[PDB]
């Protein structure tokens, strides 16, 4: 009861460490009694690894199930396997003019070809997109409203000590899994690689309730959630090291430096399980893994910067636009019709995505297709090729024509499709936009090389009789650049991309593009999409990157100020239960400093509203703060900071010790308070 | 002048960050003036990468020169190349019964063979070992006494805020490089992979003096030294990621999490330069790099854990013996004759090392030879081999006979040879002991398989007609186990070994052996050799691993106590210059809390002894602490901690904020002080 946090309230890390140390000391003291006690001590020491093991296994299994179901449903959106329903397009057209895999054309009209067949299949595609999106949104809105969104901003904030009760519950887990399957299969411009961080964390917290070492403490729960975020990123991208780096850079806030072992173990186990789910012998590390064995020239490092600029522009644009829409979704009647909005967005996406073969094609499959360089047996519109370069024809001319339309559609539709009441991610759509840009640039460069090989730009570098330009590498570079320009990741992202598509040959291009994208995006604000959404949602996230440039001390920020009412303080014996109840029920404060006397104004300690209420209720059912004596709940070591302290030290105290509130005094006299939110309000 | 630290005094991290913020604000304000100011701001922003670049290049070049010179001198200890003096044994016997490479035998006696030849070559080997060791020790003792020892404990401590003035100076760098070349070439049981962490750091600090951003600040110097330690470990083992992990785990103390980029850049550049030094086309990544393409069975994971036990025993034994000797070297007349002690040790090592071919052979070369599994063209005593296994003879029996003697000699002689006045390291000798144990175990297992293949232990796992046991993998496992049992490294060490010897096939055996070694060593004390030597030297190192188990508050530790004289405090106007001078000259304290009046005992601020002295001298050449007015030097935000505070929070303040000293009060009254050393003294 005592020391229980309220909803949407930040965590006093220091008290968590204190009670954890008390538990450790008690366990060690009980250890020496007999063999069972050392056994229990070993069990409690290994609980930190048991939670990570279970979290990794659950994350791997959930990612495998989600991927299988999303593939099957996305393919059900187009046709069905008459021979055996439990197959997708790939399996029903490979495992043997395929007579088994039938689109709705011959099912309904009876003719596989014709304008009527195309119209009816268009209608059926739109209908299935609408049905999937509507079901996902209804299920989220009715069973677990916390399933919406990528949930990386909220997990981030939750690892900064913040609290959101059901956000990582069982029902959020189940509904997020189901609705993520149903949304990635709805044709929306969204992915489930971003959301896989949340659905992974949902596992960890759940498993944290199996062990008293973590259920009864919050800081250790944050350790388990950091490990779970690493496991989630790993199982999403299949990159354990990349996932751990992402956890260090973006998500995790307190890192004792011992959890790196646990984070990497979680990531490794998650990736191992994800690999273990190979029910049909899929050799692809992920649904968008591509390998490269082609060279690049220093000249190509110029366009690889160009994409970096583009990915730096669009990124900023997106963060400049998406929030500008999300605000309008929250500050307008659009926020009262979530289901209608998602149905409208799914209908528009399915209407404008069917005509274009690339937009109609699943975003992760589109990323795979863009990554792979043209093959000899491929005659698709992408590589309709008619000297060191292949000849060109009309087909490659139309390839750019329609790929530009795909790029524009994805850019426009991901702005309106990120924040909506359905599990949506920003990794896959950003990578798709970046990869489309990269493929466009790569085709342009290859065509330039073929038509104008005689120039010294290609005469020396490009070997005669050998194709030198690699469009797939440009697509990968563009994906990395756009992803880093929307999320402002530098090394975590580059390592994620490197593991995502093996090969160290393209570390220089990847670093160049990612760094250029970040340096271009920072010119229009130094906040990534996750930081911008943490800000927009108004979460109490203390960003260490932000600098308290203002030269102001704790004198300015301590509250109450002159205008605000007198500082609320307690006493030792003068007052009674009635007084404390009256001043609690009339005050929204969660904590009261206690002094001896009104005139003395000398600090004694600190007490919390929740602890006071619980203890007072217990006493009433079943006042003397000094030695109704309620000293037990009292805090005799409340952090103080002299008013002359420049606020940088106070912010550093909050960020390092993880306090909720530090008092403020002037030469041994209590004057004000600074909660974890007071500094945030001051920054605004 | 003001705010200058004294010798062997710890660093107030908080003040360093504060003055760094002041400098940042001033530079940013000056930025807007004109183009040159933005140029200067960019220059100061890239200084952090320029220092790391220079440190990495210098570390690579110094490691290359050290390795070349050590090879040449170690080979000069045996013979010379008549055709061209600037060649070692490998080059003078490969680049064409070699007539060029002549040992001293035919040079002096004239006959290459005979008992007299052997005796005189033995005498010359001992003489050259003595000469090299004596020259190294004389040069260290006369030019830079800080060059002695591995210097990893001292660098560690220096990254914890401690200060040692010349320890990373130019002269320590030069003398350490020369004497490390001369000591690794003296036949002593020591290495230069450990010392290269110091030789790298010596570079960084030196380069830190090229830039006001780091010369005038100490915390940023510690960041550069962390990057330099990463670069040093990388250039030593050729493992950038392993070096960065070692810096994170062992050396670095404060990691803002942004220096990881700088640490990895330093490590990468150092390894790149080290590779770039290939004047004779050496394809070996390092002098002891070995590749493996052989399998292992689960059965061998039992002996691979046995070595872990052995490496866990010996490790502890070493940390139970070496310190027990180092104390005796410091608490006895042995400490008054460093040169004589090192000459005696070199003479004994050269006397007992010549007879044994493995002991006579350079420790790094011996590690390389142990790592490589037997080859078809190798007929050495190590693989004197006469069914899935090769037949055996007397030669393999003698191999174990003398390899056990090599193991015993190295174990006994590294205990007496680590701490002595000459640059010595513990990586190579520990790896050599581990690898000798590993080869012993591997040969034993292979012989068991050959003689008793019929047993089901090998009848199933070991394929008929194919050799299954890999002695070289046992050597690697033993090296890793002993290294981790003497240094108590878990993941940094495993990654260092993995990069040092490409191949993920042996990650499971390496983890098993390293973890077993650490868990066995912890049973005999939970401190690595570096921690044990930091303790023995009495450095003020606050080890986060240590737990302040004692349930005592800041009341217990605050000084002065009842017995100690009255707490030293100051006033505002009552006293005069004479009083302050008298109390400074009669007190060894470096800090003085200031209150208003003796009776009020209300805390105002804090003033350091060095600042007081400098300002007082300036005023005398060229008292009113409130608004001789010396408020400017005063600290108006001195950290306080109520006496009821359990010491864990105070230790956490010191470890996170990096304070030197926090005061201690009781209900708004100054009662005591705690320094960074008071908590350490209490722990003892
Ligand atoms: N005892 C007090 N007397 C006066 N002002 C206080 C006292 N305790 C807190 N405050 C101030 O009142 C405001 C509300 O703080 P409060 O304690 O309610 O924060 P919180 O519970 O952490 O936040 P939230 O509003 O999210 O619940 C802040 O300005 C805080 O500084
Ligand atoms: N103003 C003071 N009045 C009384 N005791 C003090 C005062 N300042 C420090 N002390 C105590 O004196 C002892 C040494 O403090 P001091 O300031 O000299 O340490 P230091 O300079 O950091 O250490 P070192 O001895 O390595 O130079 C410690 O017990 C410290 O708590
Ligand atoms: Cl959202
Ligand atoms: Cl997807
Ligand atoms: Cl996301
Ligand atoms: Cl030493
Ligand atoms: Cl060596
Ligand atoms: Cl060492």
UniProtKB/Swiss-Prot annotation, chains A, B:
The keyword Kinase does not apply. It comes from the Eukaryota. One of its GO terms (cellular component) is vesicle membrane. Residues 525-684 are cytoplasmic. It is found in: Cytoplasmic vesicle, Secretory vesicle membrane. It is a multi-pass membrane protein. Chloride binds at residues 150, 427, 530. GO terms for biological process: adult locomotory behavior; negative regulation of cell volume; neuron cellular homeostasis; phagocytosis, engulfment; photoreceptor cell maintenance; positive regulation of reactive oxygen species biosynthetic process; synaptic transmission, GABAergic; synaptic transmission, glutamatergic. May influence large dense-core vesicle exocytosis in adrenal chromaffin cells. This is H(+)/Cl(-) exchange transporter 3. The gene is Clcn3.
């Amino acid at each position: 009861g005592v020391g229980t946090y309220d909803d949407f309230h930040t965590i006093d890390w220091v008290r968590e460490k204190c009670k954890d140390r008390e538990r450790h000391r008690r366990i060690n003291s009980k250890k020496k009694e007999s063999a069972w006690e050392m056994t229990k001590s070993l069990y409690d020491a290994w609980s930190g690894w048991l939670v990570v093991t279970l979290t990794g296994l659950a994350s791997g299994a959930l990612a495998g199930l989600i991927d299988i179901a999303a593939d099957w449903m996305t393919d059900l959106k187009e046709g069905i396997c008459l021979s055996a329903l439990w197959y997708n397009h790939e399996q029903c057209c490979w495992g043997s003019k395929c007579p088994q895999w039938k689109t709705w054309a011959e099912l309904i009209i009876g003719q596989a070809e014709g304008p009527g067949s195309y119209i009816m299949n268009y209608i059926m595609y739109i209908f299935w997109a609408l049905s999937f999106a509507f079901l996902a949104v209804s299920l989220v809105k009715v069973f677990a409203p916390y399933a919406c969104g990528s949930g990386i901003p909220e997990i981030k904030t939750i690892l900064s000590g913040f609290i959101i009760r059901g956000y990582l519950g069982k029902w959020t887990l189940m509904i997020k899994t189901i609705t993520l399957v149903l949304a990635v299969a709805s044709g929306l411009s969204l992915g489930k690689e971003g959301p896989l961080v949340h659905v992974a964390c949902c596992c960890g917290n759940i498993f944290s309730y199996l062990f008293p070492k973590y259920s009864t403490n919050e800081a250790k729960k944050r350790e388990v959630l950091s490990a779970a975020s690493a496991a989630g990123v790993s199982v999403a991208f299949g990159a354990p090291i990349g996932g751990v780096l992402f956890s260090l850079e973006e998500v995790s806030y307190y890192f004792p430096l011992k959890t790196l072992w646990r984070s990497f173990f979680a990531a490794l186990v998650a990736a191992f399980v994800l690999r273990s789910i190979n029910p049909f012998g899929n050799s692809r590390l992920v649904l968008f893994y591509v390998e490269y064995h082609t060279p690049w020239y220093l000249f190509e490092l110029f366009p690889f910067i160009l994409l970096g600029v583009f990915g730096g522009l669009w990124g900023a644009f997106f963060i400049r636009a998406n929030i500008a829409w999300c605000r309008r979704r929250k500050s307008t009647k659009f926020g009262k019709y979530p289901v209608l909005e998602v149905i409208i967005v799914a209908a528009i996406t399915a209407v404008i995505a069917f005509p274009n073969p690339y937009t109609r094609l699943n975003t992760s499959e589109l990323i795979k297709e863009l990554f792979t360089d043209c093959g000899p047996l491929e005659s698709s519109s992408l590589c309709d090729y008619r000297i060191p370069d292949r000849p060109a024809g009309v087909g490659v001319y139309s390839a750019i024509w329609q790929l530009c339309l795909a790029l524009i559609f994805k850019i426009i539709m991901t702005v309106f499709t990120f924040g909506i009441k359905v599990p949506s991610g920003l990794f896959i759509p950003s990578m798709a936009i970046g990869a489309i840009a990269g493929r466009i640039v790569g085709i342009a460069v290859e065509q330039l090389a073929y038509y104008h090989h005689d120039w010294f730009i290609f005469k020396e570098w490009c070997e005669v009789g050998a194709d030198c330009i690699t469009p797939g590498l440009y697509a990968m570079v563009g994906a990395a650049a756009c992803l880093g320009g929307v999320t402002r990741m530098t090394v975590s992202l580059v390592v994620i991309v490197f593991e995502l598509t093996g090969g160290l040959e393209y570390i220089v291009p990847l670093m160049a593009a990612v760094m250029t994208s970040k340096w271009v995006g920072d010119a229009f604000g130094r906040e990534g999409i996750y930081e911008a959404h943490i800000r927009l949602n108004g979460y109490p996230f203390l960003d260490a990157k932000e600098e308290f440039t203002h030269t102001t001390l704790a004198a300015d920020v301590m509250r109450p100020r002159r205008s605000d009412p007198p500082l609320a303080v307690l006493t030792q014996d003068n007052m009674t239960v009635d007084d404390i109840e009256n001043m609690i029920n009339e005050t929204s404060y969660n904590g009261f400093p206690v002094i001896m006397s009104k005139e003395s104004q000398r600090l004694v300690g600190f007490a919390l509203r929740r602890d006071l209420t619980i203890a007072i209720e217990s006493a009433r059912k079943k006042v003397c703060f000094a030695q109704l004596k309620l000293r037990s709940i009292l805090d005799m070591s409340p952090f103080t900071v002299t008013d002359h302290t420049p606020m940088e030290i106070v912010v550093d105290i909050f960020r390092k010790l993880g306090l909720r509130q530090c008092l403020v005094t002037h030469n041994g006299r209590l004057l004000g308070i600074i909660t974890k939110k007071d500094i945030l309000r001051h920054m605004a």
